[PDB]
Amino acid sequence: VEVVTQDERKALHTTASLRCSLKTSQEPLIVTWQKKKAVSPENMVTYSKTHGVVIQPAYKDRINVTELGLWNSSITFWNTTLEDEGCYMCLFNTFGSQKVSGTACLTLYVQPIVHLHYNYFEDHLNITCSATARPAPAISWKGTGTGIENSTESHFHSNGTTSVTSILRVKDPKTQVGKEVICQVLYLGNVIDYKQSLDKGS
Amino acid sequence: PLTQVNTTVSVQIGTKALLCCFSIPLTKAVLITWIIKLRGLPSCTIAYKVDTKTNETSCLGRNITWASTPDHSPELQISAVTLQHEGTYTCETVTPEGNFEKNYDLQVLVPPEVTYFPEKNRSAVCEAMAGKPAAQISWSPDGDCVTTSESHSNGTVTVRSTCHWEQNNVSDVSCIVSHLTGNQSLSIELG
Ligand SMILES: *[C@@H]1O[C@H](CO)[C@@H](O)[C@H](O)[C@H]1NC(C)=O
Ligand SMILES: *[C@@H]1O[C@H](CO)[C@@H](O)[C@H](O)[C@H]1NC(C)=O
Ligand SMILES: *[C@@H]1O[C@H](CO)[C@@H](O)[C@H](O)[C@H]1NC(C)=O
Ligand SMILES: *[C@@H]1O[C@H](CO)[C@@H](O)[C@H](O)[C@H]1NC(C)=O
Ligand SMILES: *[C@@H]1O[C@H](CO)[C@@H](O)[C@H](O)[C@H]1NC(C)=O
Ligand SMILES: *[C@@H]1O[C@H](CO)[C@@H](O)[C@H](O)[C@H]1NC(C)=O
Ligand SMILES: *[C@@H]1O[C@H](CO)[C@@H](O)[C@H](O)[C@H]1NC(C)=O
Ligand SMILES: *[C@@H]1O[C@H](CO)[C@@H](O)[C@H](O)[C@H]1NC(C)=O
Ligand SMILES: *[C@@H]1O[C@H](CO)[C@@H](O)[C@H](O)[C@H]1NC(C)=O
Ligand SMILES: *[C@@H]1O[C@H](CO)[C@@H](O)[C@H](O)[C@H]1NC(C)=O
Ligand SMILES: *[C@@H]1O[C@H](CO)[C@@H](O)[C@H](O)[C@H]1NC(C)=O
């Protein structure tokens, strides 16, 4: 492999950096960063020893070059936007022998916000379990009771965030549910269990 | 905000070809590289470093020309294009303003050797020998025809058509040969 690059999954409205490491003897002349588009790629910035850093008017106050060098280059979005999400290429231009690309793709996330409403009445209980994240999170019930009444609804925001709300209506904590009622929420392959118990006495 | 241009160029065999870089002032440019990938040969480069006016070439054996002038980008030239010239040519210009590209798919065209003549029992023959791409043979008016295509190793194709018309009120026919290098209609007088 010629160019070493890692895709980056970082948080929305915060700093994100892409890096390419060119592995070869031949010193390049100029490095170009482009945003992969349908139609032609878009020119973002170049670094050269002869001309230094040159950012296109479009990206003027949105990125800088964090690593100045012909072998190792990094670009940094100061504060990301959904627009900034996508695929990028670092081009190493060397005299006398074509060029070499490195594609690195950027994906932005929003950490989940979870609401847990528990509501207890005559013997029976209803739990609603809401979760808003980006990408959409996965709600599931681990304090199973096989039967029960239960419905899940989702909403997509103009934000880009996705809300999922699961309403579970227990009728009696006997054979209905164990000693813990679990709302388990998966977010990009990561499950966190939200556990709810109940201690009486005698 | 154009940064890339893909183009298919068709050239008659034996005729001139001229390939142009992305259109940018030579004082502006930093590095200009032509990348040639010919049928059955590896990738290949002619490079020009603007500031020091130096060049380097992996491209020997491809039989093409690199035309240079002061204060203009270099261009590729081929006086008389051959079959082995078929392939991919790409000028890669880079300026401080970023990377630019002009890709070319060069396809060589061979005009078919066309022969035509009348025949025994009100028949006719019409042939377009080793053209590229294959030509198409029609007739006017429609007769009892059999038309066949043979492919040659050098990517040329021969198309042969023979027709009969039974005895009535038709005595003149037309072989119509369609091809990119130009269509033609040939007349025949039936035996
Ligand atoms: C990023 O920019 C947004 C405006 O779109 C602003 O609301 C937010 O506070 C900024 N955050 C940081 C960490 O710079
Ligand atoms: C980022 O680049 C701009 C040029 O658009 C320059 O004004 C600024 O000094 C740079 N900032 C940093 C932190 O390097
Ligand atoms: C490029 O990156 C490597 C590690 O990724 C770093 O150690 C090195 O300093 C850089 N190369 C050069 C020639 O500076
Ligand atoms: C809880 O339960 C009652 C039925 O017992 C139902 O009518 C009500 O809509 C539920 N409340 C919520 C907030 O889901
Ligand atoms: C959710 O509802 C379905 C039927 O609509 C049922 O099969 C399932 O058991 C319920 N989930 C739980 C945890 O009881
Ligand atoms: C995103 O903004 C919408 C308003 O469009 C809001 O309802 C939603 O809850 C927000 N989510 C976050 C995590 O800010
Ligand atoms: C030729 O044209 C398209 C659109 O300009 C471009 O995306 C593509 O990369 C080119 N095709 C190839 C095979 O390089
Ligand atoms: C190109 O390079 C060759 C060999 O290195 C040199 O002799 C020649 O002067 C150069 N010519 C041009 C036009 O750049
Ligand atoms: C180039 O020309 C030489 C004659 O010197 C010929 O042998 C060779 O086949 C040609 N190569 C191509 C790719 O046309
Ligand atoms: C291509 O092959 C056919 C059949 O051998 C021949 O007639 C034609 O002239 C060949 N060569 C070229 C250079 O077109
Ligand atoms: C040949 O005929 C086709 C239709 O069969 C027509 O579109 C085209 O104009 C003709 N070719 C030339 C070179 O005139």
Coordinates of C-alpha atoms and ligand atoms in Angstrom, one line a residue:
Chain A
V1 CA 0.0 0.0 0.0
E2 CA 1.2 3.5 -0.9
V3 CA -0.8 6.0 1.2
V4 CA -1.9 5.2 4.8
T5 CA -5.2 6.7 5.8
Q6 CA -7.9 6.0 8.3
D7 CA -11.6 6.9 8.0
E8 CA -12.7 9.1 10.9
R9 CA -16.0 8.9 12.9
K10 CA -16.1 12.0 15.1
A11 CA -18.7 14.1 16.9
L12 CA -20.9 16.7 15.2
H13 CA -20.2 20.5 15.8
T14 CA -16.7 19.7 17.0
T15 CA -13.1 19.4 15.8
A16 CA -12.3 16.6 13.3
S17 CA -9.0 15.8 11.6
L18 CA -8.0 13.7 8.6
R19 CA -4.5 12.5 8.0
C20 CA -2.5 10.8 5.2
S21 CA 0.9 9.2 5.6
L22 CA 2.7 8.7 2.3
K23 CA 5.0 5.7 2.5
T24 CA 7.7 6.0 -0.2
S25 CA 11.2 7.3 -0.9
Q26 CA 10.4 9.9 -3.6
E27 CA 9.7 13.3 -2.1
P28 CA 6.5 14.8 -3.6
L29 CA 6.2 18.4 -4.7
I30 CA 2.7 19.4 -3.8
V31 CA -0.1 17.9 -1.8
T32 CA -3.8 18.4 -2.7
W33 CA -6.9 17.8 -0.6
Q34 CA -10.2 17.3 -2.5
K35 CA -13.8 16.5 -1.5
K36 CA -15.0 13.5 -3.5
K37 CA -18.1 14.5 -5.4
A38 CA -20.3 13.1 -8.1
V39 CA -19.2 15.2 -11.2
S40 CA -15.6 16.3 -10.5
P41 CA -13.8 16.3 -7.1
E42 CA -13.6 19.7 -5.4
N43 CA -10.3 21.4 -4.7
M44 CA -9.9 22.3 -1.0
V45 CA -6.3 23.2 -0.3
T46 CA -2.7 22.6 -1.3
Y47 CA 0.6 22.5 0.6
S48 CA 3.9 23.0 -1.3
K49 CA 7.3 24.1 -0.2
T50 CA 7.2 26.7 -3.0
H51 CA 3.8 28.2 -2.2
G52 CA 3.0 27.1 1.4
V53 CA -0.6 26.6 2.3
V54 CA -3.4 27.6 -0.1
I55 CA -7.0 27.2 0.9
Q56 CA -9.7 27.6 -1.7
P57 CA -12.1 30.5 -0.9
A58 CA -14.9 28.0 -0.3
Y59 CA -13.1 26.4 2.8
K60 CA -11.4 29.6 3.9
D61 CA -12.5 29.7 7.5
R62 CA -13.6 26.1 8.0
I63 CA -10.3 24.2 7.8
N64 CA -6.6 24.6 8.2
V65 CA -3.6 22.4 7.6
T66 CA -2.7 20.8 11.0
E67 CA 0.3 18.8 9.6
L68 CA 2.6 20.8 7.2
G69 CA 4.7 18.3 5.2
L70 CA 4.9 16.6 1.9
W71 CA 5.0 13.0 3.4
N72 CA 2.5 13.5 6.2
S73 CA -0.5 15.9 5.9
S74 CA -3.5 16.6 8.1
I75 CA -6.5 18.8 7.5
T76 CA -8.7 19.9 10.4
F77 CA -12.3 21.1 10.4
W78 CA -12.6 23.4 13.4
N79 CA -16.3 22.9 13.9
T80 CA -18.1 20.3 11.8
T81 CA -21.4 20.4 9.9
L82 CA -23.5 17.8 8.2
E83 CA -22.2 19.3 5.0
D84 CA -18.6 18.4 6.1
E85 CA -19.7 14.7 6.2
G86 CA -18.5 12.7 3.3
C87 CA -15.4 11.4 1.5
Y88 CA -12.1 13.2 1.1
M89 CA -8.9 12.5 -0.9
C90 CA -5.3 13.5 -0.2
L91 CA -3.3 13.6 -3.5
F92 CA 0.5 13.4 -3.4
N93 CA 2.0 14.8 -6.6
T94 CA 5.5 13.6 -7.3
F95 CA 7.6 14.6 -10.3
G96 CA 8.1 11.9 -12.8
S97 CA 5.7 9.3 -11.7
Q98 CA 1.8 9.8 -11.7
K99 CA 0.3 10.4 -8.3
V100 CA -1.2 8.6 -5.3
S101 CA -4.5 9.0 -3.6
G102 CA -5.7 8.2 -0.1
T103 CA -9.4 8.3 0.5
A104 CA -10.6 9.0 4.0
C105 CA -14.3 9.3 4.9
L106 CA -15.8 11.4 7.7
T107 CA -18.9 10.6 9.6
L108 CA -20.4 12.7 12.3
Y109 CA -22.4 11.5 15.4
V110 CA -24.6 12.9 18.2
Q111 CA -24.3 11.1 21.6
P112 CA -27.7 9.8 22.6
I113 CA -30.1 11.4 25.1
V114 CA -32.3 8.9 26.9
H115 CA -35.6 9.6 28.7
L116 CA -36.9 6.9 31.1
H117 CA -40.5 7.4 32.4
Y118 CA -41.7 4.8 34.9
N119 CA -45.3 5.1 36.1
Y120 CA -46.8 2.9 38.8
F121 CA -50.5 2.5 39.7
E122 CA -52.8 -0.1 40.8
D123 CA -50.5 -3.1 40.9
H124 CA -49.6 -2.4 37.3
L125 CA -47.0 -0.2 35.6
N126 CA -46.2 1.4 32.4
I127 CA -42.7 2.3 31.1
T128 CA -41.9 4.6 28.2
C129 CA -38.3 4.5 26.9
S130 CA -37.2 7.4 24.6
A131 CA -33.8 7.8 22.9
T132 CA -32.5 10.6 20.6
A133 CA -29.2 10.1 18.8
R134 CA -27.4 10.1 15.4
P135 CA -27.3 7.5 14.0
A136 CA -30.7 6.1 15.1
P137 CA -30.4 4.0 18.3
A138 CA -31.8 0.6 19.0
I139 CA -34.4 0.1 21.8
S140 CA -35.2 -3.4 23.1
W141 CA -36.6 -4.8 26.3
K142 CA -34.5 -7.3 28.3
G143 CA -36.8 -7.7 31.4
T144 CA -39.0 -9.9 29.1
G145 CA -42.4 -11.2 29.9
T146 CA -43.3 -12.9 26.5
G147 CA -46.8 -11.3 26.5
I148 CA -47.5 -7.7 27.4
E149 CA -48.6 -4.7 25.3
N150 CA -45.8 -2.7 23.5
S151 CA -45.3 -0.3 20.7
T152 CA -42.2 1.5 19.2
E153 CA -42.3 4.9 17.3
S154 CA -39.5 6.8 15.6
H155 CA -39.1 10.4 14.5
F156 CA -36.6 12.0 12.2
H157 CA -35.5 15.6 12.9
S158 CA -34.5 18.5 10.8
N159 CA -31.6 18.3 13.1
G160 CA -30.5 15.0 11.6
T161 CA -30.9 13.2 14.9
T162 CA -33.4 10.3 15.2
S163 CA -35.7 9.7 18.2
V164 CA -37.0 6.2 19.1
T165 CA -39.7 5.8 21.8
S166 CA -40.9 2.4 23.1
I167 CA -44.0 2.2 25.3
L168 CA -44.4 -1.0 27.3
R169 CA -47.6 -1.5 29.4
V170 CA -47.2 -4.0 32.2
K171 CA -50.4 -5.4 33.7
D172 CA -48.9 -7.1 36.8
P173 CA -45.3 -7.6 38.0
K174 CA -45.9 -11.3 38.8
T175 CA -45.1 -13.5 35.7
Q176 CA -45.0 -10.2 33.7
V177 CA -41.5 -9.1 34.7
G178 CA -38.5 -10.2 36.8
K179 CA -37.0 -8.2 39.7
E180 CA -35.4 -5.8 37.2
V181 CA -37.0 -4.0 34.2
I182 CA -34.3 -3.4 31.6
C183 CA -34.5 -0.8 28.8
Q184 CA -31.4 -1.7 26.7
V185 CA -30.3 0.8 24.1
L186 CA -27.8 0.0 21.4
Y187 CA -25.9 2.9 19.7
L188 CA -23.4 2.0 17.0
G189 CA -22.8 -1.5 18.2
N190 CA -22.7 -0.4 21.9
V191 CA -25.4 -1.5 24.4
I192 CA -26.0 0.2 27.7
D193 CA -28.6 -1.3 30.1
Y194 CA -31.0 0.9 32.1
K195 CA -32.0 -1.1 35.1
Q196 CA -35.1 -0.5 37.4
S197 CA -35.8 -2.4 40.6
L198 CA -38.1 -2.2 43.6
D199 CA -37.4 -3.0 47.3
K200 CA -40.2 -3.5 49.8
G201 CA -39.5 -5.3 53.1
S202 CA -42.1 -7.5 55.0
Chain B
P1 CA -15.6 24.7 -10.6
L2 CA -14.7 22.1 -13.2
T3 CA -11.6 19.9 -12.1
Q4 CA -12.0 16.9 -14.3
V5 CA -12.9 16.2 -18.0
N6 CA -13.4 12.8 -19.5
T7 CA -13.5 12.7 -23.4
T8 CA -13.8 10.0 -26.1
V9 CA -11.7 10.8 -29.2
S10 CA -12.2 8.9 -32.4
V11 CA -9.4 9.1 -35.0
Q12 CA -9.3 7.6 -38.5
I13 CA -6.4 5.2 -38.8
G14 CA -3.5 7.0 -40.4
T15 CA -4.6 10.5 -39.5
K16 CA -3.4 13.2 -37.1
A17 CA -4.3 13.3 -33.4
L18 CA -3.7 16.1 -30.9
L19 CA -4.4 16.0 -27.2
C20 CA -4.7 19.1 -25.0
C21 CA -4.2 19.7 -21.3
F22 CA -6.6 21.3 -18.9
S23 CA -6.5 25.0 -20.0
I24 CA -4.4 26.9 -17.4
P25 CA -1.6 29.5 -17.8
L26 CA 1.8 27.9 -17.7
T27 CA 3.1 30.5 -15.2
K28 CA 0.4 29.4 -12.8
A29 CA 1.1 25.6 -13.0
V30 CA 3.5 23.6 -10.8
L31 CA 3.6 20.2 -12.4
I32 CA 2.2 18.7 -15.5
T33 CA 2.1 15.0 -16.2
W34 CA 0.8 12.9 -19.1
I35 CA -0.2 9.4 -18.3
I36 CA -0.4 6.9 -21.2
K37 CA -2.0 3.5 -20.9
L38 CA -1.9 1.7 -24.2
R39 CA -3.5 -1.6 -25.2
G40 CA -1.3 -4.4 -23.8
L41 CA 1.4 -2.1 -22.3
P42 CA 1.8 -0.8 -18.8
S43 CA 1.1 2.8 -17.6
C44 CA 3.6 5.3 -18.6
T45 CA 4.6 8.9 -17.8
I46 CA 6.0 12.1 -19.3
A47 CA 6.4 14.7 -16.6
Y48 CA 7.3 18.4 -16.7
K49 CA 8.3 20.4 -13.7
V50 CA 7.4 24.0 -14.4
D51 CA 9.7 26.1 -12.2
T52 CA 12.9 24.4 -13.4
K53 CA 11.6 23.3 -16.8
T54 CA 12.8 19.7 -16.3
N55 CA 11.3 16.6 -17.9
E56 CA 11.4 12.8 -17.4
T57 CA 9.9 10.0 -19.5
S58 CA 9.0 6.4 -18.9
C59 CA 7.2 6.6 -22.2
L60 CA 9.6 5.2 -24.8
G61 CA 8.2 2.6 -27.1
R62 CA 4.7 4.2 -27.2
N63 CA 5.6 6.2 -30.4
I64 CA 3.9 9.5 -29.5
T65 CA 5.1 13.1 -29.5
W66 CA 5.4 15.6 -26.7
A67 CA 5.0 19.0 -28.2
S68 CA 6.3 21.9 -26.1
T69 CA 6.4 25.7 -26.5
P70 CA 7.4 28.4 -24.1
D71 CA 4.5 29.6 -21.9
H72 CA 2.1 26.9 -23.1
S73 CA 1.3 23.5 -21.6
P74 CA 2.8 20.6 -23.5
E75 CA 0.5 18.7 -25.8
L76 CA 0.5 15.1 -27.2
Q77 CA 0.7 14.6 -30.9
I78 CA 0.4 11.6 -33.3
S79 CA 1.0 12.4 -36.9
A80 CA -0.6 9.2 -38.2
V81 CA -2.5 7.2 -35.7
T82 CA -2.2 3.3 -35.6
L83 CA -4.1 0.5 -34.0
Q84 CA -1.5 0.2 -31.2
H85 CA -2.2 3.8 -30.3
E86 CA -5.6 2.9 -29.0
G87 CA -5.8 3.6 -25.2
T88 CA -5.9 6.1 -22.4
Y89 CA -4.2 9.5 -22.3
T90 CA -4.5 11.8 -19.3
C91 CA -3.0 15.2 -18.7
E92 CA -2.7 15.9 -14.9
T93 CA -2.0 19.6 -14.2
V94 CA -1.5 20.8 -10.7
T95 CA -1.3 24.4 -9.5
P96 CA -1.5 25.8 -6.0
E97 CA -5.2 26.0 -6.7
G98 CA -5.4 22.2 -6.7
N99 CA -5.5 19.2 -9.0
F100 CA -6.9 19.2 -12.5
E101 CA -7.4 16.4 -15.0
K102 CA -8.3 15.8 -18.6
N103 CA -8.9 12.2 -19.6
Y104 CA -9.0 10.9 -23.1
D105 CA -10.2 7.6 -24.4
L106 CA -8.6 7.4 -27.9
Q107 CA -10.3 5.0 -30.2
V108 CA -8.9 4.3 -33.7
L109 CA -11.3 3.8 -36.6
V110 CA -10.7 1.7 -39.6
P111 CA -12.7 2.4 -42.8
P112 CA -13.8 -0.9 -44.4
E113 CA -12.6 -2.1 -47.7
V114 CA -15.9 -2.2 -49.6
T115 CA -16.5 -4.4 -52.7
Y116 CA -19.8 -5.0 -54.5
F117 CA -21.0 -6.8 -57.6
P118 CA -23.9 -8.6 -59.3
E119 CA -24.2 -12.3 -59.5
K120 CA -25.7 -15.5 -61.0
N121 CA -29.5 -15.9 -61.0
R122 CA -30.4 -12.3 -60.0
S123 CA -28.1 -12.1 -57.0
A124 CA -25.7 -9.6 -55.7
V125 CA -22.8 -9.4 -53.1
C126 CA -21.8 -6.6 -50.8
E127 CA -18.8 -6.7 -48.5
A128 CA -17.2 -4.3 -46.0
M129 CA -13.8 -5.9 -45.2
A130 CA -12.0 -5.4 -41.9
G131 CA -13.5 -2.1 -40.8
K132 CA -13.5 -0.8 -37.2
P133 CA -16.0 -0.8 -35.8
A134 CA -18.0 -3.2 -37.9
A135 CA -20.0 -1.6 -40.7
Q136 CA -23.7 -2.4 -41.3
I137 CA -25.0 -3.5 -44.7
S138 CA -28.6 -2.8 -45.7
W139 CA -30.3 -3.3 -49.1
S140 CA -32.8 -1.5 -51.1
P141 CA -35.2 -2.9 -51.7
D142 CA -35.4 -5.9 -49.3
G143 CA -34.4 -9.2 -50.8
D144 CA -33.5 -12.7 -49.6
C145 CA -30.3 -11.9 -47.8
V146 CA -27.7 -13.6 -45.7
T147 CA -25.3 -11.4 -43.8
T148 CA -22.3 -12.5 -41.7
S149 CA -19.7 -11.0 -39.4
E150 CA -16.1 -12.2 -38.9
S151 CA -13.9 -10.7 -36.3
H152 CA -10.2 -10.4 -36.9
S153 CA -7.6 -10.5 -34.1
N154 CA -6.6 -6.8 -34.8
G155 CA -10.1 -5.8 -33.7
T156 CA -11.3 -5.2 -37.2
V157 CA -14.6 -6.9 -38.5
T158 CA -15.6 -8.0 -41.9
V159 CA -19.3 -7.9 -42.8
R160 CA -20.5 -9.8 -45.9
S161 CA -24.0 -9.8 -47.4
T162 CA -25.4 -11.8 -50.3
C163 CA -28.9 -11.3 -51.7
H164 CA -31.3 -12.8 -54.2
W165 CA -34.5 -11.2 -55.6
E166 CA -36.9 -13.5 -57.5
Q167 CA -38.1 -12.5 -61.0
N168 CA -40.5 -9.5 -61.1
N169 CA -40.2 -5.8 -61.5
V170 CA -36.9 -5.0 -59.7
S171 CA -33.8 -4.7 -61.8
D172 CA -31.7 -2.2 -59.8
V173 CA -30.7 -2.6 -56.2
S174 CA -28.7 -0.7 -53.6
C175 CA -26.2 -1.9 -51.1
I176 CA -26.2 0.5 -48.2
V177 CA -23.0 0.5 -46.1
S178 CA -23.1 2.5 -42.9
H179 CA -20.0 3.3 -41.0
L180 CA -18.7 6.1 -38.8
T181 CA -15.9 6.9 -41.3
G182 CA -18.8 7.8 -43.6
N183 CA -21.9 6.0 -45.1
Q184 CA -22.3 5.1 -48.7
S185 CA -24.9 3.8 -51.0
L186 CA -23.7 1.6 -53.9
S187 CA -25.8 0.8 -56.9
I188 CA -25.9 -2.5 -58.7
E189 CA -27.6 -3.6 -61.9
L190 CA -29.1 -7.2 -61.7
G191 CA -28.0 -9.9 -64.2
Ligands
LIG1 C1 -19.9 25.1 16.4 O1 -20.8 25.9 15.6 C2 -22.1 25.9 16.0 C3 -22.8 26.8 14.9 O2 -23.3 26.0 13.9 C4 -22.2 26.5 17.4 O3 -23.6 26.5 17.8 C5 -21.4 25.7 18.3 O4 -21.5 26.2 19.6 C6 -20.0 25.5 17.9 N1 -19.3 24.6 18.8 C7 -18.0 24.5 19.0 C8 -17.5 23.5 19.9 O5 -17.2 25.3 18.4
LIG2 C1 -5.7 28.9 8.9 O1 -5.6 29.4 7.6 C2 -5.9 30.8 7.5 C3 -5.9 31.2 6.0 O2 -7.2 31.1 5.5 C4 -5.0 31.6 8.3 O3 -5.5 33.0 8.3 C5 -4.9 31.2 9.7 O4 -3.8 31.7 10.3 C6 -4.8 29.6 9.9 N1 -5.0 29.2 11.2 C7 -4.2 28.4 11.9 C8 -4.6 28.1 13.3 O5 -3.2 27.8 11.4
LIG3 C1 5.3 10.6 8.9 O1 4.6 9.9 10.0 C2 5.3 9.1 10.8 C3 4.4 8.2 11.6 O2 3.1 8.2 11.0 C4 6.2 10.0 11.6 O3 6.9 9.3 12.6 C5 7.2 10.8 10.7 O4 7.8 11.8 11.4 C6 6.5 11.3 9.4 N1 7.5 11.3 8.4 C7 8.4 12.2 8.2 C8 9.4 12.0 7.1 O5 8.5 13.2 9.0
LIG4 C1 -50.3 4.2 30.7 O1 -51.4 3.3 30.9 C2 -52.7 3.6 30.6 C3 -53.5 2.3 30.6 O2 -53.4 1.8 31.9 C4 -52.8 4.3 29.2 O3 -54.2 4.7 29.0 C5 -51.9 5.5 29.2 O4 -52.0 6.1 27.9 C6 -50.5 5.1 29.5 N1 -49.7 6.3 29.6 C7 -48.6 6.6 28.9 C8 -47.9 7.9 29.2 O5 -48.1 5.8 28.1
LIG5 C1 -43.7 -6.9 22.2 O1 -44.9 -7.1 21.5 C2 -44.9 -8.3 20.7 C3 -46.3 -8.5 20.1 O2 -46.8 -7.3 19.6 C4 -44.6 -9.6 21.5 O3 -44.3 -10.6 20.7 C5 -43.4 -9.4 22.5 O4 -43.3 -10.4 23.4 C6 -43.4 -8.0 23.2 N1 -42.2 -7.8 24.0 C7 -42.0 -8.2 25.3 C8 -40.7 -7.9 25.9 O5 -42.8 -8.8 26.0
LIG6 C1 -32.0 18.5 17.3 O1 -32.8 19.6 17.0 C2 -34.2 19.4 17.0 C3 -35.0 20.6 16.5 O2 -35.0 20.5 15.1 C4 -34.6 18.9 18.4 O3 -36.0 18.6 18.5 C5 -33.8 17.6 18.7 O4 -34.2 17.1 20.0 C6 -32.4 18.0 18.7 N1 -31.5 17.0 19.2 C7 -30.3 17.3 19.8 C8 -29.5 16.1 20.3 O5 -29.9 18.5 19.9
LIG7 C1 -15.0 9.9 -16.4 O1 -16.1 10.8 -16.1 C2 -16.7 10.8 -14.9 C3 -17.5 12.1 -14.7 O2 -16.7 13.2 -15.1 C4 -15.8 10.6 -13.7 O3 -16.5 10.5 -12.5 C5 -15.0 9.2 -13.9 O4 -14.1 9.1 -12.9 C6 -14.4 9.1 -15.3 N1 -14.3 7.7 -15.5 C7 -13.2 6.9 -15.2 C8 -13.4 5.5 -15.5 O5 -12.2 7.4 -14.7
LIG8 C1 14.5 17.2 -20.6 O1 15.4 16.3 -19.9 C2 16.5 15.9 -20.7 C3 17.2 14.8 -20.1 O2 17.2 14.8 -18.7 C4 17.3 17.1 -21.0 O3 18.5 16.8 -21.8 C5 16.5 18.2 -21.7 O4 17.3 19.4 -21.8 C6 15.2 18.5 -21.1 N1 14.3 19.2 -22.1 C7 13.3 20.0 -21.9 C8 12.6 20.6 -23.1 O5 12.8 20.1 -20.7
LIG9 C1 6.3 1.6 -31.9 O1 7.1 1.6 -33.0 C2 8.0 0.5 -33.1 C3 8.9 0.6 -34.3 O2 10.1 1.2 -33.8 C4 7.1 -0.8 -33.2 O3 7.9 -1.9 -33.2 C5 6.2 -0.9 -31.9 O4 5.4 -2.0 -32.1 C6 5.4 0.4 -31.8 N1 4.7 0.3 -30.5 C7 3.4 0.7 -30.4 C8 2.8 0.6 -29.1 O5 2.8 1.2 -31.4
LIG10 C1 -6.6 -6.2 -39.6 O1 -6.8 -7.6 -40.0 C2 -7.4 -7.8 -41.3 C3 -7.4 -9.3 -41.5 O2 -6.2 -9.9 -41.4 C4 -6.6 -7.1 -42.4 O3 -7.3 -7.1 -43.6 C5 -6.3 -5.7 -41.9 O4 -5.6 -5.0 -42.9 C6 -5.5 -5.8 -40.7 N1 -4.6 -4.8 -40.2 C7 -4.8 -3.5 -40.0 C8 -3.6 -2.7 -39.6 O5 -5.9 -2.9 -40.2
LIG11 C1 -25.1 6.8 -41.4 O1 -26.4 6.4 -41.2 C2 -26.9 6.7 -39.9 C3 -28.3 6.0 -39.7 O2 -28.2 4.7 -40.1 C4 -27.0 8.2 -39.7 O3 -27.5 8.5 -38.5 C5 -25.6 8.8 -39.9 O4 -25.7 10.2 -40.1 C6 -24.8 8.2 -41.1 N1 -23.4 8.5 -40.9 C7 -22.7 9.5 -41.5 C8 -21.2 9.5 -41.2 O5 -23.2 10.3 -42.2

